[PDB]
Ligand binder design. Structure first.
Ligand SMILES: NC(=O)c1ccc[n+]([C@@H]2O[C@H](COP(=O)([O-])OP(=O)(O)OC[C@H]3O[C@@H](n4cnc5c(N)ncnc54)[C@H](O)[C@@H]3O)[C@@H](O)[C@H]2O)c1
Ligand SMILES: NC(=O)c1ccc[n+]([C@@H]2O[C@H](COP(=O)([O-])OP(=O)(O)OC[C@H]3O[C@@H](n4cnc5c(N)ncnc54)[C@H](O)[C@@H]3O)[C@@H](O)[C@H]2O)c1
Lengths: 348, 348
């Protein structure tokens, strides 16, 4: 029997993914052509967004200049969207996944599996807690993740790129790959799930600082350095707080070095972080003023890093991460950022 | 006794290095204030360049909008400029190093040392042969290297960046760091010379490829993957052709990931690579029409990797490098570049 797929989420990335998943489900036999997409209902000029999506087959508010495959159906109730799904792609802003596992808990199919595209980290009474873990625990289903240099707008334009899928079960990995891959969306399945997922979360903090540096008037040599030092801390962080095995070779996958690069140069975090350096407005305000409803995962992830590090009394071990955190939330002048670069340890 | 320094070269990078070396030499006791710089004489409208430099204290033709420290003296005869030097900074386009060397052979001080900033590779009977090695053997002097994300224009504008110094001798490493370091030019000394030098050489080949993709109309996700797949081939190439230990860590130094990033975004090879993808003019002609005298090291380096690989019969082992080489010299359509990424192996 063909597998039913449900896309929980519908934003910039969620909509781009819909195009890829919609296209594959329709052309592939192993996947049910009917693909549901949970859409947090919104009123746009009196019309309901779900209505507009199923009528015009496009979510222009979040993914401009693109159509969505007709077979992707917008469903306002999450339970109804996931009810009969065999595979659930979790792709919503970090701050809402919690409540969504709410309603979903206990209303899923027997052997339903899931894959997460959410970038960020959670905290557990005992160390760091991956979003994928939290979701897999609450919903009780096998989890995988997809992480890579995939700025939505470029993906929706079908511009060549790659991504990394973290899945322990080979059979499932080859499965998710057949569902996600495209002649221009090349995937590499990997087993070190945790490392691949933390690369996605942590790279956004680095990108906020990169953004700060642009707002300070610096160029490529500097952004390269911020990227380079942040990578030093990312690997240091993963090897410290991640359960079991953590290899550096994993950071050389799309989820590490490549995602770090494309994000520091063209991600939403870089843009806002640059404006923050210039205007002095709040991360929140700029978020609302510049992203037309899309969510930043950068700042809040830094905030989470802070909490995770202090509960271990190790706040002084990650200068760059904490410098990003302090400028965003503590009021530290952006003009002192360079300083964390000038005194950053040579190795960690 | 202070050490006299001689800068062999006066180009884009040579001139910036002169500012940095000129400044520290004047400010630090261990270095003689008189800094000689060999300048390949040029007739700039009836005036000798060396005369312009020593009078106007600027080499605008190669480093626009900047002055050079008065203590940096332009010397037209390389033997005269290097004669009394204790430290020699080799920084000239790859194509001119060989001739300069046999001119210097037997004319250096007994215990003279040298550091090479030249990016490229040569070929010896059986395989690879590093430029620094060729210089050391021909001039019979100990060698070091300086390699990092260092776009000259930015280094000259005093914008924060880092660089890597590859030196086997600790004492000599610290000394070179004192002569080269700046509050905005941060140095890390490592002993893996060979790997550091191979990174500078190889990354330009990747940058030519990045420029191609820009010329094909692609964005950041594609450039990121280009850099990522390029790194994969770099490490695999270094581990296979370099003498002695080649650690993957070394690539996380400025000379590796960083320079890879900055070059692919604001380097001369990228600029020309793009113009080549658009106009169809020869690289040589573009080099002349766009860099007002400056020299690209990327295309010739690819031409060299081809020679090396074709002598080991491994031309088929490095798709990306050889794709860069083929588009540059065989007439392979540039549009066919993405094809070497789509079919690129996942691991090497
Ligand atoms: N934007 C990208 O290019 C990109 C690329 C790779 C991964 N991602 C990741 O994808 C995840 C999803 O982000 P995204 O880009 O699809 O969205 P957005 O950040 O593009 O959009 C905000 C979305 O949140 C929803 N929303 C707003 N208020 C809500 C509420 N109160 N409750 C529930 N939902 C609400 C809206 O329905 C809208 O779809 C993120 O974790 C991010 O890291 C994004
Ligand atoms: N440009 C950069 O930002 C940068 C940054 C790091 C490393 N580098 C490396 O530094 C090395 C030096 O490059 P550069 O940027 O100073 O030069 P250019 O490429 O900036 O200049 C060409 C130079 O070559 C000289 N020249 C021309 N014809 C010659 C001849 N026939 N004989 C001898 N010399 C001749 C000129 O005097 C001129 O100074 C290169 O190998 C490069 O990879 C450059």
């Amino acid at each position: 029997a063909s597998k039913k797929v449900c896309i929980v989420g519908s934003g910039n990335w969620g909509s781009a993914i819909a195009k890829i998943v919609g296209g594959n489900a329709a052309q592939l036999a192993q996947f049910d052509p009917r693909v549901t997409m949970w859409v947090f209902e919104e009123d746009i000029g009196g019309k309901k967004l779900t209505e507009i999506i199923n009528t015009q087959h496009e979510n222009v508010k979040y993914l401009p200049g693109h159509k969505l495959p007709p077979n992707v159906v917008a469903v306002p109730d999450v339970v109804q969207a996931a009810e009969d799904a065999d595979i659930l792609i979790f792709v919503v802003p970090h701050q809402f996944i919690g409540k969504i596992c709410d309603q979903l808990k206990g209303h899923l199919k027997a052997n339903p599996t899931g894959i997460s595209l959410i970038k960020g980290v959670d905290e557990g009474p005992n160390g760091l807690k991956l979003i994928s873990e939290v979701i897999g625990e609450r919903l009780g289903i096998p989890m995988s993740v997809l992480m890579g240099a995939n700025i939505a707008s470029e993906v929706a334009d079908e511009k060549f790129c790659e991504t990394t899928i973290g899945c322990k079960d080979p059979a499932q990995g080859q499965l998710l790959k057949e569902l996600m891959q495209t002649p221009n969306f090349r995937i590499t399945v990997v087993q070190e799930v945790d490392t691949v997922e933390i690369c996605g979360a942590l790279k956004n903090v680095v990108a906020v600082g990169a953004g700060f540096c642009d707002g300070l008037g610096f160029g490529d040599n500097t952004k390269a350095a911020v990227i380079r030092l942040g990578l030093m801390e990312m690997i240091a962080f993963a090897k410290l707080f991640c359960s079991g095995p953590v290899s550096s070779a994993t950071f050389l996958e799309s989820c590490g070095v490549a995602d770090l690069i494309t994000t520091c140069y063209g991600g939403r975090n870089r843009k806002v972080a640059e404006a923050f350096a210039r205007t002095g407005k709040s991360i929140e305000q700029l978020e609302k003023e510049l992203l037309n409803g899309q969510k930043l995962q950068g700042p809040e992830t830094a905030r989470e890093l802070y909490s995770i590090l202090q509960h271990k009394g190790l706040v002084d071990k990650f200068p760059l991460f904490m410098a990003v955190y302090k400028v965003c939330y503590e009021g530290q002048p952006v003009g002192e950022f360079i300083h964390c670069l000038q005194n950053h340890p040579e190795h960690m």
